Design a protein around this ligand. Structure first.
Ligand code: CLA
Ligand code: CLA
Ligand code: CLA
Ligand code: CLA
Ligand code: CLA
Ligand code: CLA
Ligand code: CLA
Ligand SMILES: CCCCCCCCCCCCCCCC(=O)OC[C@H](COP(=O)(O)OC[C@@H](O)CO)OC(=O)CCCCCCCCCCCCCCC
Ligand SMILES: CC1=C(/C=C/C(C)=C/C=C/C(C)=C/C=C/C=C(C)/C=C/C=C(C)/C=C/C2=C(C)CCCC2(C)C)C(C)(C)CCC1
Ligand SMILES: CC1=C(/C=C/C(C)=C/C=C/C(C)=C\C=C\C=C(C)\C=C\C=C(C)\C=C\C2=C(C)CCCC2(C)C)C(C)(C)CCC1
Ligand SMILES: CC1=C(C/C=C(\C)CCC[C@H](C)CCC[C@H](C)CCCC(C)C)C(=O)c2ccccc2C1=O
Ligand code: SF4
Ligand code: SF4
Lengths: 80, 733, 30, 75, 141, 37, 75, 138, 39
């Protein structure tokens, strides 16, 4: 499975958690930003690796990283 | 599930990706599971032993097929007339026409003509019978057996070396400089003075009269007493015939410094003296580094004491950077090996050292092109492992402010200057070529930009070529260089000047306005390949598009369509692009070499000298004119001996265009196509019975970049080998 | 030329690098 | 479409176009190549692309030299 | 020196070609004046004039005169574009003025290129030609 | 394919084996191996 | 294309009797030849008021004008 | 897994043998109004009155369906549940794993997948050599 | 009319006017002094 890591630079803009097709990500409470929320990746065994979450992240460089790794049935998107 | 046992992350995906990536990752020993540095080094060591045995079995097979199926007995009667047979054709597909066409060079079976030049090499080093080659082949079988046993032995836990043994740079440098580069060169000088020079002068020195027949009438006592002039007493006279005794001379070590006037190559005594000098210098250079005893150098002291003001830390902590990193060591090894393979190619055609290999033209062309292609591959691999070092083994903390840190601290400046020089040189080489081409096409060839390559002509004049009218260093016999006033030790100079000023040999070819533009095209190719390679090496740690590429590794596919699109950002993709540019540059230089030598060999040098200055000259006098004998290798009338080369020509075109398929069309199209095919298989009767264990997926992005690169390379090489080998063998034997 | 039995002698000699290569590759596989 | 126009050009050059002599005989432009050469790839590369580009690459210094320039430009 | 190349006046091949130089222009004496012009050059056995790029002043017109001429009328282009681009970076919308060129300013800059080498040495001695290594944006290193 | 050289029967038997028995056996063993467990 | 590769290989191997030639294993386009036969035989039966054939590409006479072939049957 | 299936005419895009050998996914939504939606397998179907049960073969197809249920319908259907059903029989519950959709902060979730640094302080591969790890996960 | 002024001032119109002007002066110099391989 791919590992989705969220770093300190998250501004809680929710863009990654709704850009994600498989809804791997979710927003959890946090105390380090104005929005008082940070993205987490609980169901990260469902990540296919599409990187639409990295595409939607406004912070520079990136507050969310997808690190492609051991492929499985869920992380390769095979209907067969 | 079990196949990529070195990596558990590949033994889990139920796809064909694990098969492909198991084959690819199998030799990347750093990424295997349960790998420590010691097990890394020991597995590497035994892999080296297996590869040494591969090399020895390969040369054993070459010897065994020259001995068994080749006409080596017949070829050493008249090497000028008979073509050397490589091995025998045996395939059941041949019709009557192909069997009669491929029966050549005085055989009964269909045979393959050897263009590797092993016949000339075996004839020069004194091998004159099929039994000598058979003994050599069996000896190399036993030597390969010995190295296989050595590798298996050093995988045994009792004989597995420690990490301190592999990280011992000074002792390895001592034993390689002295015992491997110097003792083997000394042993080759011994074979030359004992076996090759005497059997070039006529007498048989086998293993039986090896001890009974001294190489010189004077013994070794003149060698000990210092009176070394007797070994250069009477050199080989300029009417000497190879393989027999007419004006032999009986001098084992001379330094005439020209060419043998009959074999057109260098004198074997000159070769032996060369290897003696090289062995002496390499042996004393292997006593430089500290070992168990007291004298010598420590490399850490040498490196860390080279600190200047304009670099700061200088070379501090470069010993541990090179020693702990295997990709740095492999990059340095491949860079030096690529440089000296280029050197081998550039010297074996102008200074041939084998009997009658300068008069067999196809093997000279094949050897030059072969070694220049190997040199291009090794140089690209040197830069690839520079990039892999910068990804994996580079520590920017220990390498603080030294030369590597300052390489990365200004990479934009030198990448932009390589960009400028490649753009500058490419703009004006294409501008001059298109200008010459357009004004020749407009009926006015007098309007061409024809530039005299005066600098290289001046270099040739300094080496003694007095054709261009310069009288500078060796073209002026009154100068300090030609006389060598303090000693007049120029024993080589009369022979060298007699060899450089003869128009026959390829030594210091005449260089004209058509050579200027192709040298600048070659410089453009070298600079652009270097630009891509260092742009992958220095941007392997990240650019502004992706400030972390060290964590994704070397060969990740992309980074998504975000940040504008990030398709070929990995350093592996710079390897990919520079592989294309390497193949192009070597195509340019081997095209240039081939056409220049087709002018020189045929005597009609005017064809190159007036037609190489514009691009349709390259296109109609080289590509079109010289493939006439190629594509007619099989026509509806019949088949001649250049039929397998015409077939390989078309085969290489097909492999090249399949490479286009992999490089242009990308993975999404093929993945949904395979999804439709998978539906077809799972929903049809009588084929529902057969089910895949590994789910069919399309080839990965980086995998199919590699596959298209492999196709491009293989088809490119096969097409050019077929063309170069059938164009010379079309018109020269 | 070359003998008939020298070729078979070369084959039975090269049977020894075959065995040692098989055992080296097997030991590398560990 | 490049295969279509190569098929057309070779078929008309070998089997249709040509000069009819007043005796009634017809001689074609490439002299019936297509029957035996258009069945192998070497016949397309030798009797069509190599053989019929002698008019476009030898055209330098003449009126057809613009087509040679355009040939190289397309490459 | 240069014994390989004979001057085109005393060359057989060049005389053979110059009997039939073509007409590049409407003028019917263009080939004759071209043959008279190339007769002073150095040409090889092929009969085509060669250029000498050593920097020797006997052949300074072969390369060095076009070298100086191009360097002047391309430093003109570089300096004019640089001065215009520097000028438009204080107009509160420097990006639109690359799209729509401010032609009074552009023509004023283009006629400012007469004195670019003096402007180049002035800006290099006064530090406006280059920028410091820290002041410019850069990649991770 | 006549063989003038020594042991002409040896290519007669070794071209089928290296052409078929070596590929069929090697791909069969590798197919059992890469798909085992 | 595999017929083209097969022909190209069989010509390289000196087996021109194994090729897919007209003087070898033959693959005649029998349906297109039948349609050409129907259009040659058209202007008498299946197009009574047509004096000549629709085109000479199907069959008929070589039309030579100014010494050059305008249209002749395409076999 | 209660719910009548949508009135779909069948298609070749759909459940392959992956569905009855390993997991397949069911999306269950409730709508008052009968209308027409685009199945991600290709085509158009009929939303039944009340509960629906659509079996799909990928999770991305189920979430794409739920996405178009949310955004392409003016009476937005947001009470859609996505299950993962196994041929052995047990049913998992996947997409609204907590009460509320992942965009909204439930305040009872746990921050996993969160690193305590930015990417600049990520460790470098030379430090972790032959450690069996990779520079993110250290 | 300030719109034709701002359209004739765009990058493509001005670059094509500039290229046409440089092409014109180059072509005229080749028309009057035809064949200048060197000084
Ligand atoms: C004197 C003792 C000695 C000798 C002879 C060698 C010999 C060798 N060592 Mg060893 N080694 C030594 C001691 C020695 N070592 C010591 C003491 C250390 C411990 C510190 C090591 C540690 C060490 C390791 C760790 C490794 C080696 C390796 C090897 C091999 C590298 C050479 C090779 O494969 O290409 C042969 C190269 C040459 C013969 C010369 C190079 C060619 C030059 C550039 C000239 C070019 C050729 C010329 C132009 C013309 C030739 C053309 C002609 C053929 C037609 C070779 C068998 C490697 C190996 O293969 O392991 C099995 C390996 O991985 N050794
Ligand atoms: C002294 C020679 C030498 C050595 C020992 C290495 C060794 C290494 N290289 Mg390589 N390399 C070299 C030369 C060398 N290379 C040259 C000359 C090139 C330029 C073509 C490169 C370009 C290069 C790239 C770009 C990459 C490496 C990588 C690798 C590593 C894994 C090997 C692998 O994946 O192959 C396993 C085998 C295959 C993939 C099979 C494909 C090879 C050809 C197509 C098949 C030939 C087989 C045929 C029967 C002969 C390994 C450390 C890879 C890596 O991950 O580095 C850490 C990497 O990405 N190499
Ligand atoms: C005919 C084919 C062709 C041409 C002309 C170019 C041209 C160039 N390549 Mg190259 N390249 C090609 C094929 C080609 N490539 C292929 C097939 C690949 C393999 C994937 C690459 C991969 C590639 C890499 C990866 C890189 C280049 C780069 C460049 C530049 C090299 C600098 C140079 O040569 O001076 C310029 C010479 C020219 C002839 C430029 C052509 C423009 C002509 C003169 C007309 C322009 C006038 C007007 C616009 C019309 C230049 C733009 C390098 C680069 O950009 O460095 C700055 C770079 O890094 N190339
Ligand atoms: C006038 C603006 C300007 C100037 C002063 C520079 C100056 C520089 N460029 Mg260039 N460059 C520019 C425009 C400019 N460039 C544009 C528009 C392009 C896009 C194609 C580039 C792309 C480019 C590349 C890719 C590289 C350079 C590099 C360089 C350096 C060497 C000179 C050279 O190679 O020229 C080369 C110039 C070109 C290839 C194209 C020039 C385009 C025109 C002729 C310039 C004028 C543009 C514009 C019309 C001026 C406006 C006029 C004003 C009245 C509105 C130098 C610092 C090189 C470098 O890295 O230096 C170390 C290099 O590799 N430049
Ligand atoms: C790697 C070196 C090399 C190469 C390229 C070849 C290539 C060839 N050999 Mg072989 N051969 C070699 C080594 C080599 N040989 C050695 C060392 C021996 C001595 C025992 C022989 C003995 C030999 C026989 C007796 C015959 C050939 C034949 C052939 C041809 C068909 C292949 C075949 O039937 O395999 C047969 C191969 C073997 C019986 C043993 C080959 C073992 C090598 C060393 C494997 C190398 C592993 C590789 C590097 C990885 C082909 C020209 C046939 C031929 O000429 O037909 C016309 C044939 O009859 N070979
Ligand atoms: C490199 C190896 C090689 C070799 C040696 C052959 C050799 C052969 N090919 Mg083949 N071919 C190959 C590769 C090879 N090909 C490849 C890679 C291609 C794909 C491009 C082809 C494509 C090709 C085609 C399409 C055809 C040939 C055919 C032929 C055969 C022509 C004569 C014949 O009728 O045989 C008859 C067949 C045989 C001799 C096969 C052996 C079967 C007999 C029964 C022996 C088995 C004995 C017994 C049952 C088992 C003994 C067990 C043992 C342990 C003792 C000939 C034996 C032709 C043919 O007739 O094929 C059948 C033909 O039509 N080949
Ligand atoms: C970038 C390289 C470059 C270089 C250095 C030149 C240089 C020159 N060309 Mg040239 N040319 C170029 C590329 C280049 N060309 C290209 C790419 C083509 C094709 C469009 C032309 C086509 C061309 C023609 C057809 C003519 C020139 C001519 C000229 C000469 C004088 C031009 C003038 O106005 O005075 C000069 C030697 C003219 C001349 O007098 O040549 C001697 C001339 O008639 N050139
Ligand atoms: C002409 C054909 C070959 C051209 C190749 C093009 C290479 C590009 C040249 C750019 C100049 C590089 C600036 C040197 C970078 C630099 O500042 O080096 C300065 C260096 C002095 O360094 P130090 O001796 O202070 O360095 C201490 C240690 O680094 C080594 O002693 O002297 C050089 O110029 C030697 C370099 C020659 C080799 C280049
Ligand atoms: C490993 C690595 C790397 C590297 C690689 C490369 C980069 C390579 C290249 C390099 C090269 C490849 C180089 C070359 C060299 C050159 C030289 C070295 C030259 C010089 C020579 C000489 C000096 C000579 C001279 C002379 C003459 C010419 C004549 C006679 C006399 C004399 C001899 C004096 C990198 C950094 C990436 C990264 C890290 C890793
Ligand atoms: C003389 C001669 C020669 C030689 C040459 C040489 C060797 C040179 C060198 C030179 C060099 C090696 C140079 C370098 C440079 C560097 C740098 C550093 C540069 C600078 C630049 C800049 C600063 C720029 C600026 C500008 C301007 C000026 C104007 C325009 C704009 C711009 C901004 C671009 C030859 C033989 C060929 C020929 C004859 C003559
Ligand atoms: C054709 C093609 C495919 C389809 C390729 C597939 C499905 C696999 C191709 C292999 C087939 C099975 C033929 C294999 C035959 C070869 C001789 C390979 C032999 C196996 C090796 C071990 C040598 C891709 O998946 C792809 C992906 C990304 C970019 C481009 C492409 C692409 O061009
Ligand atoms: S898109 Fe980026 S900044 Fe926005 S919530 Fe997700 S991780 Fe944070
Ligand atoms: S096209 Fe392929 S390589 Fe390029 S960004 Fe998209 S997925 Fe990555």
């Amino acid at each position: 499975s791919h590992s989705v890591k969220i770093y300190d630079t998250c501004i809680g803009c929710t863009q990654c958690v709704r850009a994600c097709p498989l809804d791997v990500l979710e927003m959890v409470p946090w105390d380090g930003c104005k929005a008082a929320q940070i993205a987490s990746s609980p169901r990260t065994e469902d990540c296919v690796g599409c990187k639409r979450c990295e595409t939607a992240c406004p912070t520079d460089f990136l507050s969310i990283r997808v690190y492609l790794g051991a492929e499985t049935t869920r992380s390769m998107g095979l209907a067969y | 599930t079990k196949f990529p046992k070195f990596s558990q992350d590949l033994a889990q995906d139920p796809t064909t990706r694990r098969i492909w990536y198991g084959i690819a990752t199998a030799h990347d020993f750093e990424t295997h599971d349960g790998m420590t540095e010691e097990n890394l080094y020991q597995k590497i060591f035994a892999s080296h032993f297996g590869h040494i045995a591969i090399i020895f079995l390969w040369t054993s097979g070459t010897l065994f097929h020259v001995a068994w199926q080749g006409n080596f007995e017949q070829w050493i009667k008249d090497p000028l007339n008979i073509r050397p047979i490589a091995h025998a054709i045996w395939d059941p597909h041949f019709g009557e026409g192909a069997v009669n066409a491929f029966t050549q060079a005085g055989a009964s079976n269909p045979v393959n003509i050897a263009y590797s030049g092993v016949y000339h090499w075996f004839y020069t080093i004194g091998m004159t019978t099929n039994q000598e080659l058979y003994s050599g082949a069996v000896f190399l079988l036993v030597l390969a057996s010995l190295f296989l046993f050595a590798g298996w032995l050093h995988l045994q836990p009792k004989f597995r070396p420690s990490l301190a043994w592999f990280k011992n740079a000074e002792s390895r440098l001592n034993h390689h400089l002295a015992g491997l580069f110097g003792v083997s060169s000394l042993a080759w000088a011994g074979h030359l003075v004992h076996v090759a020079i005497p059997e070039a002068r006529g007498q048989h020195v086998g293993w039986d009269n090896f001890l009974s027949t001294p190489p010189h009438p004077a013994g070794l006592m003149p060698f000990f007493t210092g009176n070394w002039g007797v070994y250069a007493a009477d050199p080989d006279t300029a009417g000497h015939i190879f393989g027999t005794s007419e004006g032999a001379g009986t001098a084992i070590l001379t330094f005439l410094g020209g060419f043998h006037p009959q074999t057109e190559s260098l004198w074997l005594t000159d070769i032996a003296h060369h290897h003696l000098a090289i062995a002496v210098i390499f042996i004393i250079a292997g006593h430089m580094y500290r070992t168990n005893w007291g004298i010598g150098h420590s490399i850490k002291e040498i490196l860390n004491a080279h600190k200047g003001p304009l670099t700061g830390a200088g070379h501090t902590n470069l010993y541990d950077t090179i020693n702990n990193s295997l990709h740095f060591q492999l990059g340095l090894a491949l860079a030096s090996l690529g440089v000296i393979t280029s050197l081998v190619a550039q010297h074996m055609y102008s200074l041939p050292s084998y009997a009658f290999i300068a008069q067999d033209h196809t093997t000279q062309a094949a050897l030059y092109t072969h070694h220049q292609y190997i040199a291009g591959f090794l140089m690209v691999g040197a830069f690839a492992h520079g990039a892999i070092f910068f990804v994996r083994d580079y520590d920017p903390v220990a390498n603080k402010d030294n030369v590597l840190a300052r390489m990365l601290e200004h990479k934009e400046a030198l990448i932009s200057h390589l960009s400028w020089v490649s753009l500058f040189l490419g703009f004006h080489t294409l501008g001059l070529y298109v200008h010459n081409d357009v004004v020749v096409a407009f009926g006015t060839p007098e309007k061409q930009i024809l530039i005299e390559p005066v600098f290289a002509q001046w270099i040739q004049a300094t080496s003694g070529k007095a054709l261009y009218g310069f009288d500078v260093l060796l073209s002026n016999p009154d100068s300090i260089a030609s006389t060598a006033w303090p000693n007049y030790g120029n024993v080589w100079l009369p022979g060298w000047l007699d060899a450089i000023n003869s128009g026959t040999n390829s030594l210091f070819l005449t260089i004209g306005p058509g050579d200027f533009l192709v040298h600048h095209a070659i410089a453009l190719g070298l600079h652009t390949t270097a630009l891509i390679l260092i742009k992958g090496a220095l941007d392997a740690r990240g650019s502004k598009l992706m400030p972390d590429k060290k964590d994704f590794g070397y060969s990740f596919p992309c980074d998504g369509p975000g940040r504008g699109g990030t398709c070929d950002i990995s350093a592996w993709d710079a390897f990919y692009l520079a592989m294309f540019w390497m193949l192009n540059t070597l195509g340019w230089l081997t095209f240039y070499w081939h056409w220049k030598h087709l002018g020189v060999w045929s005597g009609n040098v005017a064809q190159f000298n007036e037609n190489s200055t514009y691009l349709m000259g390259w296109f109609r006098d080289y590509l079109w004119a010289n493939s006439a004998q190629l594509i007619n290798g099989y026509n509806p009338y019949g088949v001649n001996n250049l039929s397998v080369w015409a077939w390989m020509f078309l085969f290489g075109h097909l492999v090249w265009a399949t490479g286009f398929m992999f490089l242009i069309s990308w993975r999404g199209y093929w993945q949904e196509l395979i999804e439709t095919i998978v539906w077809a298989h799972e929903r049809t009767p009588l084929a529902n019975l057969v089910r895949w264990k590994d789910k069919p997926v399309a080839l990965s992005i980086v995998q199919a970049r590699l596959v298209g690169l492999a196709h491009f390379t293989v088809g490119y090489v096969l097409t050019y080998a077929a063309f170069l080998i059938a164009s010379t063998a079309g018109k020269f034997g | 030329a070359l003998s008939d039995t020298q070729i078979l002698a070369a084959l039975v000699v090269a049977l020894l690098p075959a065995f040692l290569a098989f055992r080296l590759s097997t030991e590398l596989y560990k | 479409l490049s295969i279509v126009i190569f098929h057309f050009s070779w078929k008309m050059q070998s089997d249709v176009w040509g000069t009819v002599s007043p005796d009634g005989s017809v001689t074609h432009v490439t002299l019936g190549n297509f029957a035996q050469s258009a069945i192998t790839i070497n016949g397309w590369l030798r009797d069509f692309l190599w053989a019929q580009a002698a008019n476009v690459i030898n055209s330098y210094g003449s009126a057809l030299s613009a087509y040679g320039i355009m040939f190289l430009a397309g490459h | 020196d240069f014994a390989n190349l004979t001057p085109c006046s005393e060359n057989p091949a060049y005389l053979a070609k110059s009997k039939n130089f073509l007409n590049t222009t409407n003028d019917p004496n263009s080939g004759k004046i071209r043959a008279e012009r190339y007769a002073s050059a150095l040409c090889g056995p092929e009969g085509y004039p060669h250029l000498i790029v050593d920097g020797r002043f006997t052949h300074a017109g072969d390369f060095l005169i076009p070298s100086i001429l191009f360097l002047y009328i391309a430093g003109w282009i570089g300096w004019v574009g640089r001065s215009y681009l520097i000028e438009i970076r204080e107009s509160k919308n420097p990006e639109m003025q690359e799209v729509v060129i401010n032609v009074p300013l552009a023509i004023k800059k283009m006629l400012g290129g007469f004195l670019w080498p003096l402007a180049a040495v002035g800006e290099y001695t006064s530090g406006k030609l280059v920028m410091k290594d820290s002041e410019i944006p850069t990649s991770p290193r | 394919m006549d063989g003038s050289y020594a042991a002409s029967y040896l290519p007669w038997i070794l071209i089928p084996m290296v052409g078929w028995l070596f590929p069929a056996v090697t791909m069969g063993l590798l197919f059992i191996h890469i798909e085992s467990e | 294309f595999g017929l083209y590769i097969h022909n190209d290989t069989m010509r390289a191997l000196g087996r021109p009797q194994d090729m897919f030639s007209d003087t070898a294993i033959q693959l005649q386009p029998i349906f297109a030849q039948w349609v050409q036969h129907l259009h040659t035989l058209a202007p008498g039966a299946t197009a009574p008021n047509a004096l000549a054939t629709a085109s000479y590409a199907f069959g008929g006479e070589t039309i030579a004008v100014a010494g050059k072939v305008a249209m002749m049957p395409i076999t | 897994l209660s719910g009548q299936p949508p009135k779909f005419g069948g298609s070749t895009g759909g459940l392959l043998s992956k569905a009855n050998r390993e997991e397949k996914y069911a999306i269950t939504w409730t709508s008052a109004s009968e209308q027409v939606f685009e199945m991600p397998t290709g085509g158009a179907a009929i939303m039944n009155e009340g509960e629906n049960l659509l079996y799909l073969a990928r999770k991305e197809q189920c979430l794409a369906l739920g996405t178009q249920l949310r955004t392409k319908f003016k009476p937005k259907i947001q009470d859609y549940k996505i299950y993962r059903v196994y041929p052995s029989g047990e049913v998992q519950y996947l997409h609204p794993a907590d009460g509320v959709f992942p965009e909204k902060v439930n305040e009872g979730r746990e921050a996993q997948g969160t690193k305590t640094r930015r990417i600049g302080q990520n460790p470098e591969p030379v430090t972790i050599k032959f450690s069996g790890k990779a520079p993110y996960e250290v | 009319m300030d719109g034709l002024k701002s359209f004739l001032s765009t990058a493509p119109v001005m670059i094509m006017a500039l290229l046409t002007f440089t092409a014109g002066i180059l072509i005229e110099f080749n028309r009057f002094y035809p064949d200048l391989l060197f000084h």
